[PDB]
Design a protein around this ligand. Structure first.
Ligand code: H01
Ligand code: MG
Ligand code: MG
Length: 309
């Protein structure tokens, strides 16, 4: 009775083992293999956050859980999840090829990043649809952004509320909320890319919902290319806000990210933490969505809304 549909889940990607680090970063750096010192640095970063292998399992678990949940919450469509990654196998084109091989003719895609950008989301979507057209007989409808899905906003609002609620009286009254996503080259502005606007909307929505009056928008994890790169970077923003107003606690909500990967566990929980430790402030970073039922239900709602269901 049910309509068979592909569920194409797209993400940045993460190495599966320490031995994947070289090729993963080469790919991110557009063919420029890291020198031995940087490679070792990277290995040490992964070791410090507790290993690489758990990290890559989250994306699999997200996709699996989302398929299962969508299949249970409605009765018209049977979804089959396929993972398509930007920087490591299974690549986006691999996933689309597999769907076509498997007799999928109709699919919905979603990127595990809630904000639209020309660099990330739009590129993934183009690549997916281009491989589908190349093979023929397979259409894909693509989610573009979902940062404003009420269930997703509520996820973050509730975590933020719990964080503040757990603070001592003096910290709660003198805290700063820093809402962040992955930095991108500043040149996206020439296309009128709404990515920066969507992050400030995300921050607005979360702060408003949590009853947080003092918040700021920051960027993190920028690459090293000759052009900038959206700023301010969270490290610089943290110190600057402290110098400006003396905040005693900083709460990091890397809303651009959906899971416990290197950008959060290292770029917040180490890099921002060094800064908060230095200035004498408490560090807080609520739990990432990961594969949690509340988050999977938000994603389910996003997918079905896109389908008009
Ligand atoms: C060393 C290097 C990096 N990135 C590039 C280079 C070598 C080219 C040059 O600088 O002349 C180059 C690019 N990154 C780009 C683009 C459009 C280029 C130009 C490519 C060309 O035409 O040659 C985009 C880009 N890049 C990154 C992302 S994002 O993570 O999805 O946000 C995106 C969208 C990520 C990184 N690129 C990096 C690094 S890292 O310094 O940490 O090793 C990172 C974390 C480094
Ligand atoms: Mg960095
Ligand atoms: Mg620069």
């Amino acid at each position: 009775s049910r309509k068979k549909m592909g569920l194409l889940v797209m993400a940045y990607g993460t190495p599966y083992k320490e031995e994947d680090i070289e090729r993963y970063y080469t790919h991110i750096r557009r063919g420029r293999k890291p020198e031995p010192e940087m490679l070792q640095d990277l290995k040490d970063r992964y070791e410090a956050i507790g290993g690489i292998s758990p990290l890559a399992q989250i994306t699999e678990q997200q996709a699996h859980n989302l398929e299962q949940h969508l299949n249970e919450i409605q009765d018209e469509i049977t979804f089959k999840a396929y993972i398509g990654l930007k920087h490591i196998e299974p690549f986006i084109e691999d996933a689309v090829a597999e769907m076509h091989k498997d007799g999928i003719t109709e699919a919905v895609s979603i990127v595990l990043a809630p904000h639209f950008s020309t660099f990330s989301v739009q590129s993934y979507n183009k690549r997916a649809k281009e491989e589908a057209e190349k093979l023929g007989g397979l259409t894909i409808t693509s989610v573009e952004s979902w940062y404003d899905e009420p269930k997703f906003v509520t996820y973050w609002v509730d975590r933020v509320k719990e964080t503040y609620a757990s603070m001592p009286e003096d910290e709660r009254e003198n805290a700063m909320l820093i809402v962040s996503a992955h930095s991108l080259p500043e040149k996206i502005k020439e296309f009128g890319d709404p990515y920066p606007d969507q992050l400030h909307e995300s921050a607005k929505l979360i702060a408003e919902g949590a009853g947080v009056s003092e918040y700021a928008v920051g960027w993190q994890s920028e690459g090293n290319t000759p052009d900038p790169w959206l700023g301010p970077d969270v490290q610089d923003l943290t110190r600057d806000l402290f110098e400006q107003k003396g905040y005693q606690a900083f709460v990091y909500v890397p809303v651009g990210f959906v899971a416990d990967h290197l950008e959060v566990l290292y770029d917040n929980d180490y890099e921002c933490k060094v800064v908060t430790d230095d200035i004498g402030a408490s560090y807080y970073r609520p739990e990432m969505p990961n594969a949690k039922p509340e988050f999977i239900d938000a994603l389910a709602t996003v997918v079905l809304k896109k389908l008009g269901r």
